[PDB]
Design a protein around this nucleic acid. Sequence first.
RNA 1: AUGAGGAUUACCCAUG
RNA 2: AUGAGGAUUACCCAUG
RNA 3: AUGAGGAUUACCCAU
Lengths: 129, 129, 129, 129, 129, 129
Amino acid sequence: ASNFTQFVLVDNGGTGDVTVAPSNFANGVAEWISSNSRSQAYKVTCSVRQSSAQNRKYTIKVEVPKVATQTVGGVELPVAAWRSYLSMELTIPIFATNSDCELIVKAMQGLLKDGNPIPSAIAANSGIY
Amino acid sequence: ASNFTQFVLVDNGGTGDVTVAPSNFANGVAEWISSNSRSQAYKVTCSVRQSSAQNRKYTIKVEVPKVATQTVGGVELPVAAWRSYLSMELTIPIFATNSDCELIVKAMQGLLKDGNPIPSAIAANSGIY
Amino acid sequence: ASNFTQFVLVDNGGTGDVTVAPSNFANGVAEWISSNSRSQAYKVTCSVRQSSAQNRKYTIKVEVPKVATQTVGGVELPVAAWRSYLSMELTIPIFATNSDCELIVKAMQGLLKDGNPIPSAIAANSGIY
Amino acid sequence: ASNFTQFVLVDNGGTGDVTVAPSNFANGVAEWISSNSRSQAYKVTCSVRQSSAQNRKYTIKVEVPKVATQTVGGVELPVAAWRSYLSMELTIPIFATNSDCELIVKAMQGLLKDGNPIPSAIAANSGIY
Amino acid sequence: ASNFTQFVLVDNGGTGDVTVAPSNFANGVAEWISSNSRSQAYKVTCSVRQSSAQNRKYTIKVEVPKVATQTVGGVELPVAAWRSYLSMELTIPIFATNSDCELIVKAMQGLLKDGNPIPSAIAANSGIY
Amino acid sequence: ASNFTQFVLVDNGGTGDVTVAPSNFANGVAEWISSNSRSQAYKVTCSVRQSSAQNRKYTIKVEVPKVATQTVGGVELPVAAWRSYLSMELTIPIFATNSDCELIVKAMQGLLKDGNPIPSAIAANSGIY
RNA sequence: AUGAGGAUUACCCAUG
RNA sequence: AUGAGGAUUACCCAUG
RNA sequence: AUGAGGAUUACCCAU
């Protein structure tokens, strides 16, 4: 294959889409970044290694900028007030076949599918109630 | 409303769908398990806490099992050959708007959409290259 | 440009073709793994480093697995009955030009060419005679 | 029958062809040396031995010389400016059938096939990238 | 894309051009070397790290050799009489826009443009006066 | 000669050009500064000294202002958020002739030439990938 | 609070 | 983190 | 750094 390619991170139906493209590959850690100042960019990083003798583990990180009242290209401090951080860690036993892995991916897609509890809770500054 | 409802975790087109439902909320940790014996069930847990003075942190966990029947002491028991674990932590500043949060959700959905680099790598037991 | 890509390790015409793809490149050690169960995958690693003042040293490593199913307690897992390990080390002085290196490669290819003493001895559970 | 014979180590079509011929086979170590000055000759050695109870272990060794003339005191001698050393060790379990071995050989040939990552990296004084 | 491609380092109008190509990416340090023996090659290395919490730092190195043939122990070896070293560090705030960065690049290009003070002084073995 | 003269640092094709002119010569350290408040100016400094008995060394420093959302003449804090710093250090052995030095300058120009990896990486808030 | 730190996964480890 | 600090250049030195 | 040293193969071992 060669999966390290540009892709659409935020899909707003063609118009207003946020595309993130490869920007670094130091130490096997792939990185995609949107076209912004590094302080306001959407950032995605991913890597895999065999955590133990029994498992392999993907470490996926995502950074999403606060947009409401944002000043494009401006200096916005404190940084912690303007950014959200996602840190995923997927552990998969070495016995998992391609099929097993496809199932795992589907489970992840379903977890975040539109309308389901988790995503709708997050999207509303809410918890479970 | 209420968002603590059941949802289909693994969608196999209506037939063979892994649907998970509410099962516990003790200690502020919402739990969903698939309709199986506790030993072979799929598990999803979620919780939100106001970590910093200015951050809210979601902690989500998903467990995908590889169901199997094991003969222990000459008796067959429903068990799991192994489990795949997804542990994710999402940190959102309190200044995030609902619109700002929807953006985070959309990013996560685009991250795992079919065909995009990351889910592709995972499903093929490979890294990004 | 990039040479850290997917390639054919075993060529069985166009069918049994064993392909190994990049998986990780941490600490100057490149790693390729064939698809499906990590437990039954082929592995190839490589690294170069300045061993002494005048020498650079390559460390190639290959693993050929014997695919098999392991049944225990009635639970079967994809495993490798055993593995064949290849560990080679190539030392090349810094005075070697690209031409000198091409020659070294030809020597390695010739060593293992079909019909020659060494490869044919190995292929037949034999030694030299 | 005999596989301890002369063979082509470097194939330069039908001209620069480096041929190496048997020279000695003492203590289970077969040795091939190219013709002319031992000082500027190519060397190849090989041996097999039962490393452990279930493993047999091959130890192949190759030397590629950089032909040069050494003048000292007005006396010139055929020497090797330097040498490139290849030291490989192949371990094969005793359960390996002739088929398993043929596969192992194909893996070795594939590893060094023209155009693939490793051989092409070596041939260019490069590493992986 | 990919930006890890070869490029002409020293342009002598198509004839005698010193072109350098990718050769290593181990440890997050991209390396390019000219098509020579490792001992006489031109070398270019680059790396980026997020130094401060709000800075990104590029570290670039270039090595220009003075090729020579040295007689060591009565044998001739390709070597470098000496080397000229360029070590540059560029610190860019994370708030820098792509446009802000293009400005940095243009400044560096204008800095070394033919006829301008600095490259003039360097090329004449003198200081600024 | 007398190279300490005003020159164009950022060339935007005649219109919008950034010219930097001599502004200080204390301690043999030449300084050029653009026509701005010292906090928002483009600054260039250069000096040469014999670092050791074998080498001479040029120390070139450049400072480039963040322009996006900049407020001309305003007080912008923190300073580290609004400025980029370039620190070049060129070491040249005392044996280098004028010609040798011209080569070194060309190498530097080629390193930063438009379209080449290093400059295009910087100009895109990127690394090598 | 961090960790391309580990897990048997609502637990354990290291450093602010 | 600095250094018109040094190098044999992906290494070493001094001070925040 | 070598070991026709061992390996659960980027570990372990004498010199």
